[PDB]
Amino acid sequence: LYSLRPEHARERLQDDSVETVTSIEQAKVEEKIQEVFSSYKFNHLVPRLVLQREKHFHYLKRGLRQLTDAYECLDASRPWLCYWILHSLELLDEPIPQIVATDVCQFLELCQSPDGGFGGGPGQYPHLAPTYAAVNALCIIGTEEAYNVINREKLLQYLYSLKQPDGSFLMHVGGEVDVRSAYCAASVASLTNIITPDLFEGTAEWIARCQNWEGGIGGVPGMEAHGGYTFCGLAALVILKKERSLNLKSLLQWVTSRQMRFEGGFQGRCNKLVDGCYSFWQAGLLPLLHRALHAQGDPALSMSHWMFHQQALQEYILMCCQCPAGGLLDKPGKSRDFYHTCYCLSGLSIAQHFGSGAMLHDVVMGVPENVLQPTHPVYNIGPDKVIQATTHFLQKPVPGF
Amino acid sequence: FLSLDSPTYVLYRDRAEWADIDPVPQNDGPSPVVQIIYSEKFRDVYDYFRAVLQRDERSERAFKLTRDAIELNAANYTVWHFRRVLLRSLQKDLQEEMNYITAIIEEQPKNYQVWHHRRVLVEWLKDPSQELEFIADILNQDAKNYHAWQHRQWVIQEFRLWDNELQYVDQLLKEDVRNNSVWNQRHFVISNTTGYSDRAVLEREVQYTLEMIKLVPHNESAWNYLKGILQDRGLSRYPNLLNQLLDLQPSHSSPYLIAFLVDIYEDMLENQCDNKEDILNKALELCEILAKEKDTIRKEYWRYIGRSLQSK
Ligand SMILES: Cn1cncc1[C@H](OCc1nc(Cl)c(C#N)cc1-c1cccc(Cl)c1)c1ccc(C#N)cc1
Ligand SMILES: CC(C)CCCC(C)CCCC(C)C[C@@H](O)P(=O)(O)O
Numbered sequence: 180l181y182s183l184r185p186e187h188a189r190e191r192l193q194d195d196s197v198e199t200v201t202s203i204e205q206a207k208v209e210e211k212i213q214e215v216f217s218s219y220k221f222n223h224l225v226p227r228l229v230l231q232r233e234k235h236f237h238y239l240k241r242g243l244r245q246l247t248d249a250y251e252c253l254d255a256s257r258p259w260l261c262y263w264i265l266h267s268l269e270l271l272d273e274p275i276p277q278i279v280a281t282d283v284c285q286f287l288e289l290c291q292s293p294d295g296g297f298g299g300g301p302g303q304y305p306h307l308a309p310t311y312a313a314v315n316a317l318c319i320i321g322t323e324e325a326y327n328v329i330n331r332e333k334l335l336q337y338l339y340s341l342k343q344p345d346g347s348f349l350m351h352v353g354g355e356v357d358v359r360s361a362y363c364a365a366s367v368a369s370l371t372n373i374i375t376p377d378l379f380e381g382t383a384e385w386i387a388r389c390q391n392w393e394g395g396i397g398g399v400p401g402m403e404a405h406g407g408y409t410f411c412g413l414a415a416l417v418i419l420k421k422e423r424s425l426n427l428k429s430l431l432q433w434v435t436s437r438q439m440r441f442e443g444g445f446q447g448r449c450n451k452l453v454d455g456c457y458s459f460w461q462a463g464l465l466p467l468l469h470r471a472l473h474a475q476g477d478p479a480l481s482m483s484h485w486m487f488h489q490q491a492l493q494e495y496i497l498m499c500c501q502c503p504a505g506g507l508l509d510k511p512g513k514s515r516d517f518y519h520t521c522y523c524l525s526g527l528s529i530a531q532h533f534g535s536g537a538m539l540h541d542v543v544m545g546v547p548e549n550v551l552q553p554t555h556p557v558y559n560i561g562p563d564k565v566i567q568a569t570t571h572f573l574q575k576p577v578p579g580f
Numbered sequence: 581f582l583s584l585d586s587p588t589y590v591l592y593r594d595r596a597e598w599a600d601i602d603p604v605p606q607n608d609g610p611s612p613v614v615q616i617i618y619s620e621k622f623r624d625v626y627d628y629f630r631a632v633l634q635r636d637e638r639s640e641r642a643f644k645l646t647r648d649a650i651e652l653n654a655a656n657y658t659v660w661h662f663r664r665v666l667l668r669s670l671q672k673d674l675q676e677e678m679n680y681i682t683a684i685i686e687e688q689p690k691n692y693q694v695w696h697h698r699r700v701l702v703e704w705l706k707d708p709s710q711e712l713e714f715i716a717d718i719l720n721q722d723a724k725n726y727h728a729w730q731h732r733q734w735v736i737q738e739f740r741l742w743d744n745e746l747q748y749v750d751q752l753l754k755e756d757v758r759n760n761s762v763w764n765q766r767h768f769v770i771s772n773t774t775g776y777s778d779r780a781v782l783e784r785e786v787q788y789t790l791e792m793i794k795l796v797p798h799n800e801s802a803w804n805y806l807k808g809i810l811q812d813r814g815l816s817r818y819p820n821l822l823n824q825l826l827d828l829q830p831s832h833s834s835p836y837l838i839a840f841l842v843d844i845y846e847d848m849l850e851n852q853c854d855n856k857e858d859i860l861n862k863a864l865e866l867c868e869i870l871a872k873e874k875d876t877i878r879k880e881y882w883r884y885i886g887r888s889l890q891s892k
């Protein structure tokens with residue numbers, strides 16, 4: 180176990196004898212993580228990395244049908260809640276009955292708006308985040324009924340009610356603008372086969388405009404590089420096929436740099452702590468840069484592993500991101516929720532499945548039962564659900580009005 | 581009116597003023613998915629807001645209703661909007677609203693709506709007189725609040741409040757040089773005001789940085805930043821630097837330094853130099869001391885580098 184290896188210990192933090200809030204907080208975590216690492220060699224037990232599939236399943240199974248008033252703060256993100264669980268169950272390779280699916284379908288419906296978008300709950304003004312999650316969740320189903328629901332026409336009408344003239348997109352009528360909208364709109368419009376020759380004009384150009392002095396990408400120009408935004412930017416550029424818009428080599432070095440040398444997991448921004456969800460947002464950037472670089476014809480590109488430490492990330496998620504009661508989480512000590520669960524698993528998967536055409540190298544760590552279903556790097560949904568998705572809606576027309 | 585967290589506070593369904601109104605329940609459906617078990621208070625304030633929203637009652641009892649429905653979920657956009665609509669139609673005092681947002685943001689400075697609301701009011705009142713300082717209040721509770729630095733950028737760009745920013749980033753940097761937000765705000769000011777093309781300033785930042793880079797040799801911030809500027813033009817345009825760094829190998833070393841050196845050998849090779857075999861030798865060397873022992877976590881990266889130079 181790379182993480183339990185003795186040399187690893189020398190991977191701790193060197194605060195160069197100068198103490199600050201940054202180093203300090205990092206010290207707290209580096210030591211916290213240690214404890215769980217040596218937990219084994221402490222109780223005198225053989226390290227065995229398993230994924231409590233069963234405990235995550237019950238935590239979710241029901242969560243997908245009812246939650247406590249602790250999830251009230253997400254009363255406006257229920258569609259999000261669906262995607263997170265749904266994808267999770269999907270990732271754990273679980274079944275979504277013909278019952279429940281229909282129940283979901285019917286829910287997203289009322290969530291949808293007669294204006295074309297998807298609110299964050301029944302009868303709520305449309306928003307691009309819930310719309311993104313809604314679509315995604317409806318594509319994880321596949322069933323005709325699912326694919327339907329989505330009023331493609333009004334969808335474009337909506338996406339249009341948000342396009343801006345400098346390229347960027349509005350989060351929602353009256354809301355704000357940050358890369359997230361670009362990808363959100365790009366993920367749905369593409370999956371629904373509703374993209375027009377103009378729909379996304381100037382976007383690739385504005386998205387790239389977000390790539391800052393530190394290889395990464397910020398929410399808005401001039402904004403610090405962030406993992407959630409960089410993914411949204413790069414992923415959006417992929418959907419648009421303008422990868423070549425950013426300094427791919429500079430972003431790579433930035434992202435690769437986001438993996439913690441000791442913890443093993445990824446950090447969202449340089450000099451911040453580790454966080455399970457970034458195991459997808461950050462780590463998930465590598466499968467994309469890979470396709471782009473290769474797309475460019477790079478021959479010094481691997482053919483078995485992603486340009487990031489799969490082993491170590493996989494350990495971290497397993498060792499310190501699993502709730503013993505079920506659900507994954509930020510880092511040890513924190514509490515469980517479905518967002519982190521969904522992205523912790525998502526990161527796990529990404530970290531154990533490789534491809535490059537005929538290439539396909541898997542690196543499941545610990546128990547072989549910890550191997551999960553594959554996830555698409557762009558849409559973050561089964562590579563098949565996305566195949567079904569497109570090919571289907573594809574058989575329909577592009578709402579040229 | 582009645583504070584939502586006051587011991588006295590009473591459910592709407594028990595309030596007189598709200599006797600003519602019939603609160604409309606949520607419509608989850610026959611088979612509810614991800615249904616939330618709302619508490620009484622929460623489910624009260626919203627089933628009612630539903631009504632007000634429903635009959636677009638641009639009332640005052642409603643404007644108050646949104647302060648609550650917002651406290652129960654300040655991340656509910658549909659509601660922040662109706663409020664905006666009520667502030668206008670109701671012709672409400674935007675300074676009062678300034679005070680409200682100011683406070684409520686102190687309670688949750690990691691929320692998207694609370695901040696977007698702030699911007700709007702400032703765009704309405706076309707007055708940032710109190711921005712750069714309330715934002716410092718927040719950045720004093722959390723120097724890395726993504727929203728706070730975002731609002732701060734806007735405030736500065738829109739009303740051109742540059743000037744004293746470096747005198748701000750310079751403050752916080754001394755406050756904790758490991759802060760990457762301030763290092764970003766630093767590149768922000770300069771690049772947008774005096775720019776970096778100006779040899780002096782650059783020459784200046786370069787030093788300043790280097791000191792940090794040699795004051796806390798393990799701060800990846802000063803490192804990513806130093807390469808941050810010299811990087812555009814070519815890390816290979818500046819001969820000196822290299823040795824000036826090599827001159828730290830023993831003294832102040834870290835994967836950052838060595839990686840910098842590898843970064844340089846990568847430009848010192850792009851613009852067809854002399855000693856290919858010495859760069860394309862001492863450079864592949866490093867990717868190895870890095871990928872094999874020094875910076876092994878990104879082993880597949882480093883090995884990739886040395887594998888790239890080979891072809892190209
Ligand atoms: C804490 N943290 C660490 N890393 C990121 C965050 C933080 O968690 C908020 C958040 N918390 C939770 Cl607990 C849940 C759930 N369940 C969902 C969301 C949640 C809300 C809205 C959207 C999404 Cl995707 C998730 C966050 C904030 C903004 C965005 C964005 N855009 C994403 C994450
Ligand atoms: C909506 C999406 C498709 C993706 C969202 C991705 C993100 C995790 C975005 C992160 C938002 C911000 C600014 C979070 C900050 O509070 P922090 O850097 O502390 O995580």
Ligand SMILES: [Zn+2]
Nearest residue numbers: 454455456509
């Ligand atoms: Zn997280």
